[PDB]
Design a protein around this ligand. Structure first.
Ligand SMILES: CCCCCCCCCCCCCCCCCC(=O)OC[C@H](COP(=O)(O)OCCN)OC(=O)CCCCCCCCCCCCCCCCC
Ligand SMILES: CCCCCCCCCCCCCCCCCC(=O)OC[C@H](COP(=O)(O)OCCN)OC(=O)CCCCCCCCCCCCCCCCC
Ligand SMILES: CCCCCCCCCCCCCCCCCC(=O)OC[C@H](COP(=O)(O)OCCN)OC(=O)CCCCCCCCCCCCCCCCC
Ligand SMILES: *[C@@H]1O[C@H](CO[C@@H]2O[C@@H](C)[C@@H](O)[C@@H](O)[C@@H]2O)[C@@H](O[C@@H]2O[C@H](CO)[C@@H](O)[C@H](O)[C@H]2NC(C)=O)[C@H](O)[C@H]1NC(C)=O
Ligand SMILES: *[C@@H]1O[C@H](CO[C@@H]2O[C@@H](C)[C@@H](O)[C@@H](O)[C@@H]2O)[C@@H](O[C@@H]2O[C@H](CO)[C@@H](O)[C@H](O)[C@H]2NC(C)=O)[C@H](O)[C@H]1NC(C)=O
Ligand SMILES: *[C@@H]1O[C@H](CO[C@@H]2O[C@@H](C)[C@@H](O)[C@@H](O)[C@@H]2O)[C@@H](O[C@@H]2O[C@H](CO)[C@@H](O)[C@H](O)[C@H]2NC(C)=O)[C@H](O)[C@H]1NC(C)=O
Lengths: 74, 504, 74, 504, 504, 74
């Protein structure tokens, strides 16, 4: 199945949420492990982003967005 | 006195002119209210309780299957059928297999096959609804009545201490209470039990003796077999196919397999929800706030007409400093001149006897008429060096005191505390320690407008998306051509980044 | 916890994979739910994409990447 | 004949000059090989088996905790410590609570606390490694020997049909077999049981009596408690903090709670893995391929020197059509002229009576000498209308046959099947029906290098990312400067899209 | 002689040297084949029959509902539920009503309501499949053997006339028959009973004892309740909601009503289908064709060695003209000359007595040896005036004949008949009265290609859309004189219009 | 219920179809009844057609297509 992810109730009360100790590790570990398991996609994304964008900032932003889209297939 | 060991503690210096003040009680906090010629009071909201909750929907998270069966049809002979497809407790599926002379068919090609298995739930979770007219808040009030230090977190015989302690139950049909405090007079509370935490878009979820408060959208997006919260002997499970998978093995057969228990998957899906507890059939909640208005016009000092104490005092233990800078002083008194007034001064130099720090416990007294009785005072010494001088005459005892820090650091920490309160409470933060005024009204209005817009735009983001969008907005602002959009972009980005990296 | 997602073994053998019948539902359902639940994000994403890109194609790709990153928080 | 009612079926029209041919058996398919003056053979890889697999790592997915203990310190007294923090069977964590005179401490502030609980695994999943020297493939061979139709998927007394059926076991210690086929002579297979499916980067995962073949770097990135090596009672576990959560509620106490069974979460994480089965301690696999070289020199037709029959044939069934366009004709024969050669013509012009199609069952014969015996032929009739005429003289019988389609559609279907086999098998697809040649060699080499590069760049990608990257590459190609880059982008994108939409 | 009164009649003037010819028998037709020194034959395909039909699906077209019930829930309490929602024989639906203090509820708002009703089918229709290997054609053959006029549609004791009449059954397992005709020898028929009418695209529909042949796409898009042809005792009706409508009346109550009998709506939906009949369990069909090949090498004239008759002839009836221009002459012969040859001339000028028109009845003879016996001849007189002179000597009778028209009008009528045959049969029309040739094969191939393209483009269009599209195409072909495109557009438009305005 | 309409088997065989006598009645009657009971739509369609077409033929074709689309709402 694919159960939905609950939105963060942080900053709604003074209490801590259900698994707040892992709220940061969740995305970081996933993204890092995916990037280590698939190093060629980094080259693919670099090529695509450098071809699509005109200015260097646009190229960097394209590359970052692609590298973020890949591991969480969205 | 119940507020002394708490790390999240607020001090309200009530306005002299009026007699009412607005406070907001929270579950992980406690408020100390001090007014000019009245006793100091401690308020703590300890429990929220919801009753008469209605069940909405049950979800199955662990199921079995049994009595599997299959049936097949020759090609060009319509779909296969089993009588179990006329039973609602079975889950069935249809597919295609290869048929030919070897299988007993007269033709060659894809024939139809059906597989049926009897579904059975072994473990389910429930969701319930909470109406704001069924909540009940519990507030505890303590008087700084010079009880000794062994009474701070002491609940022994608390039903007899009718003068120093009070317990208040605030409901929607009783939101205004007259609290009687013995010889201290009375206070009046006017609370708003219907507009605290927004229980209108929350369900009370129960799974295996654990309880959460969860969003309603999230609860309806669950992908498990479910039936209605209505009562019935045999329930029809909707969406049984969420836990049963059918598979064809190389176009020769079809088989059903049930998925495993989903308890851990749900635990992982509830990552940001709020936890709760149970009490019989009632939900017990330890999050949220409650806005109240306090009227202290009938509150009076007990023992303002006491005589000074004549005997000698000793320090019953070492004066300690609380994390907010106040100091607790426990004294022991010898001699029995009944309840008397404790003479205590806080001075920068013992030569002049000029008071420089104030008291938190207003009107400290000896409470017993016994020989060696203990009492406790709370004081607010000045920054730097000071002296706590207790007693009169030749038996005055003295204790040197040092309070580190400065007034600038105090103002800075007050500002950060106020900013955190704003971030948690929204526009309700403007009603904390408020006595009216045009500035507070304008501020609350502007905050309401901007908070509504901000929630409409950036409502459904996590710390990750908050960080990303904030950095993108700061970059877009650093490159804006003209002003008024550069500062706007950078301000929104900085706000998002501040929200993303927050704590608690 | 955060268990990793197995890569698809489709087109490795002639057999079908473990939960192949649901291989399209997950991403689509998640993305469409999140997207129609949060309309203001569409506005802010469009603003950012139009402000960052130079050509029409660049702005469209920017907006698409943002609208894909947000639901699956990556 | 075991290949007739199969939907995934290939036809190797064997080389005329040579005597060996390369084939690739697959678990879902089946191959029919026909050569000039030899009988037609059916090959089917039916089972892969792995024995004596090496335990690699165990993960816990359901656990308990018990014997909770705690230790607290007053502020400015260091960290809290428990003796169980030295025991590896305990999971422990440190936090801070609020301390003051109310709790039993002499100062006010954050005191250190530590909580410890005894971890116990209730249910675990195992991973094993399969070595190429552990594998044992099982192949089945059948001869088109004019057996009747009731023998297609018939395994009764299969240990007595030593002439028409054969069972072959291929291991890495015996990659070459010769198979005797009674009066048909013998064939010889030289297989490569060490290069079929890449078991070098797959583990055999077992969980609650279900088995998968999973990637290795996915199995190493699981986030559960784990240990290595064999498994025995009261074991030791690493990373127990993955199933246990510690919490301080409002800085007042610390509690530990264990997460729920992760069976369903693992099932959901295994979405794209391959399934498998067990045979005691042996992995039973029904996926992957096996490349072999077939040598058919000592394969000879049987009964090629029989006399033509003289009695009267009847149709025992209605001639049916298989999904590939062939036809199976079951004939009954009266008369006892012994094993005789069956006269049968397939003609599209009764004026010329010239043959138009071709048989699949080479040399159809009557195999018995009894009164009324049955046999079966398989024919590849021509497109359009034709007649199947059986017998001689006046007692002939005829059957009208219509075969829809054309040869252009046949060629297009063959091209699609070849492209699918390429996509599934990589460069190994060049060894299918291969008889040598330098064109095959250079094609296989180029496919090898391009497939290596393509797997390095776009190896692990779901249909979603495949679609997105493919569309982006197609756009980049459509807007490229000229050639030599544009069409490369368009080809890579089109290949990604063709992969993302493929099935099975 | 059985083709004499028929209005849709064809003439195959047999090749002189050849001995075989290709014909296409149609159900509303009749073929008359004449060869040089052979008797004339009449062929009529009378019946098509299909047996062993498999039931595919049953649709309900008249149903009832009973045992309606409703249930309601207060707002914020989930969906409503009745136990009947757990019965497959019930159809249920959910909606919202208004709830408040008046309805017995505690809140105000939209409550959930559920209505359930027991579905029951009263009248259902059935669809069955037809296998081309189960068709059985029936062909009747008659000889122009000088039987008298009272035998044209006479079947009394037809089982005794084993010389002039023949019945032929044609199946797929017997497509070639040798028909013996007594003293006339025998013919051989080689038919194609698998490619006449595309029964693989048609179902046999049965509704209230009426039968149709319908498309399969149309049958699978019916929107009534249905269950499988794999019949059981108690069937589960799918899609019951097609015949049941639920309505909420002003948000206070929900009700269920069943729609009426859909028999007339189905009749209206079947507007362009084919009708059919039943014969027990078999489908009897009276449409479609049958291509066959005739071999006449063993067919011989009976009575070519008789002597001329010597007695007296009278016209037993007035010579009548048939629709195609031929003439039937019934003679009565007085004379016991036994079987003798009838002397008959058809001449334009009686001075030379040169024959100008041919006969249809080859070798007219007096069959019976009795006194006053009757016989019938059929002739094809020339255009204009002519004389039919019968008898010998001076006692011979004459009849004046006028045949209106010309050979140009005859050729135009033949062209129109051929165009209609093409429009009905497609490329199969090129096999009518064919003996082979390169022109025939080339024309049939081009017709096949163009007909495939035309059926792909304008296949399923009514006369209305045909007319509209044809006019649009003619228009755009008018105002576009590009190379070879104008004539293509206007030709396709003319084809579409000619198809639209055609009649059955 | 909207049952589907069977395609015409005219010119498939020599036989007549099920209700062939009404093959022309079923469209003409309906079209003309609707066009007579709705005269204002004629003016609407004329305005639209003359506004969209450039040459006279395009205008006539647009008007005809709208007048045909309206009665059988398609
Ligand atoms: C730094 C100060 C606080 C930051 C902050 O979060 O302000 C609140 C608002 C978004 O938060 P809101 O939706 O108001 O409620 C939060 C409930 N957890 O953030 C905002 O954008 C509105 C803050 C406006 C502050 C007062 C302006 C009036 C002067
Ligand atoms: C469509 C036809 C090609 C299908 C295809 O995918 O080509 C193979 C290759 C990528 O697939 P590969 O990794 O070889 O095999 C996957 C095993 N599951 O795709 C490639 O990038 C290489 C294909 C080149 C083939 C040889 C051409 C030279 C002759
Ligand atoms: C007037 C001539 C005949 C009209 C006609 O129907 O032409 C045939 C073809 C479409 O009709 P088709 O599908 O072939 O037959 C329908 C069977 N019920 O219409 C076509 O477009 C093909 C016509 C080809 C005619 C012969 C060309 C070879 C010279
Ligand atoms: C915790 O409180 C108990 C109860 O104190 C009494 O009840 C309170 C409501 C308040 O009125 C106190 O002043 C009362 O004394 C303490 O137990 C009492 O201790 C006193 C002192 O010796 C003794 O005279 C009483 O008999 C005790 N009462 C009982 C019921 O045992 C207790 O000492 C407090 N704990 C600490 C650490 O100070
Ligand atoms: C399935 O096969 C059995 C056994 O077939 C026999 O053994 C085979 C290895 C092969 O050598 C066959 O030729 C043998 O006959 C069939 O059972 C036999 O059927 C025949 C009739 O065809 C009968 O005369 C024998 O007595 C039977 N013997 C036994 C042991 O059963 C069986 O009929 C086959 N099934 C079908 C559907 O044809
Ligand atoms: C319709 O046919 C019957 C039967 O004809 C006989 O059988 C035929 C197969 C063929 O062989 C004929 O030549 C046979 O005579 C006719 O009935 C016969 O009529 C003749 C003369 O009228 C008489 O001598 C026979 O006895 C009759 N036999 C029977 C069985 O009825 C009948 O007259 C024919 N109808 C017409 C209108 O001509």
């Amino acid at each position: 199945i694919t159960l939905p992810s609950h939105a963060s109730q942080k900053l709604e009360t003074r209490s801590s949420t259900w698994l707040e100790s892992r709220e940061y590790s969740k995305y970081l570990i996933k993204v890092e492990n995916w990037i280590l398991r698939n190093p060629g996609y980094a080259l693919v994304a670099a090529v695509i982003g450098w071809t699509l964008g005109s200015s260097r900032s646009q190229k960097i932003i394209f590359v970052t967005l692609l590298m973020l889209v890949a591991p969480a297939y969205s | 006195i119940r507020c002394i060991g708490i790390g999240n503690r607020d001090f309200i210096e009530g306005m002299s002119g009026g007699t009412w003040v607005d406070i907001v009680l929270e579950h992980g906090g406690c408020v100390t209210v001090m007014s000019n010629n009245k006793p100091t009071l401690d308020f703590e909201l300890v429990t929220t309780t919801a009753s008469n909750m209605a069940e909405v929907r049950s979800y199955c998270y662990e199921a079995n299957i049994s009595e599997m069966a299959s049936d097949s049809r020759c090609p060009t002979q319509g779909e296969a059928y089993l009588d179990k497809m006329a039973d609602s407790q079975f889950v069935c599926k249809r597919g295609y297999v290869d048929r030919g002379w070897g299988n007993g068919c007269g033709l060659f090609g894809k024939g139809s096959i059906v597989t049926c298995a009897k579904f059975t739930c072994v473990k389910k979770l429930t969701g319930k609804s909470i109406q704001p007219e069924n909540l009940e808040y519990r507030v505890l009030v303590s008087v700084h009545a010079s009880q000794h230090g062994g009474m701070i977190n002491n609940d022994t015989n608390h039903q007899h201490d009718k003068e120093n302690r009070a317990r208040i139950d605030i409901t929607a049909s009783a939101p205004r209470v007259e609290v009687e405090l013995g010889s201290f007079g009375s206070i009046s509370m006017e609370c708003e039990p219907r507009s605290g935490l927004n229980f209108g878009d929350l369900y009370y979820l129960t799974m295996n003796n654990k309880h959460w408060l969860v969003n309603r959208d999230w609860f309806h997006d669950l992908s498990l077999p479910w039936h209605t919260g209505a009562t019935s002997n045999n329930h029809h499970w909707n969406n049984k196919e969420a836990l049963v998978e059918f598979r064809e093995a190389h176009a020769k057969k079809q088989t059903a397999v049930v998925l495993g228990s989903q308890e851990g998957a749900v635990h992982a899906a509830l990552a940001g929800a709020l936890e709760a507890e149970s009490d019989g059939h009632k939900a017990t909640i330890y999050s949220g706030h409650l806005k109240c208005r306090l009227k202290l016009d009938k509150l009076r000092l007990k023992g303002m007409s006491y005589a000074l104490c004549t005997g000698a005092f000793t320090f019953a233990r070492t004066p300690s400093e609380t994390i907010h800078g106040t100091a607790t002083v426990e004294l022991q008194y010898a001699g029995e001149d009944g309840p008397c007034k404790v003479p205590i001064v806080i001075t920068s130099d013992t030569n002049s006897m000029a008071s420089t720090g104030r008291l938190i416990t207003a009107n400290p007294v000896v409470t017993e008429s016994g020989a060696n009785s203990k009492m406790m005072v709370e004081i607010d010494p000045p920054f730097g060096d000071s002296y706590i001088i207790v007693g009169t005459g030749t038996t005055k005892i003295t204790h040197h005191w040092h309070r580190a820090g400065s007034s600038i650091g105090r103002a800075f920490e007050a500002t950060m505390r106020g900013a955190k309160r704003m971030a948690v409470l929204g526009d309700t933060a403007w009603d904390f320690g408020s006595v009216g005024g045009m500035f507070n009204s304008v501020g609350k209005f502007v905050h309401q407008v901007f908070g509504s817009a901000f929630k409409a735009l950036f409502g459904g983001m996590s710390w990750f998306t908050q960080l990303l969008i904030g950095f993108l907005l700061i970059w877009m602002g650093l490159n804006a051509r003209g002003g008024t959009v550069a500062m706007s972009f950078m301000g929104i980005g900085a706000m998002l980044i501040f929200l993303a990296t927050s704590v608690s």
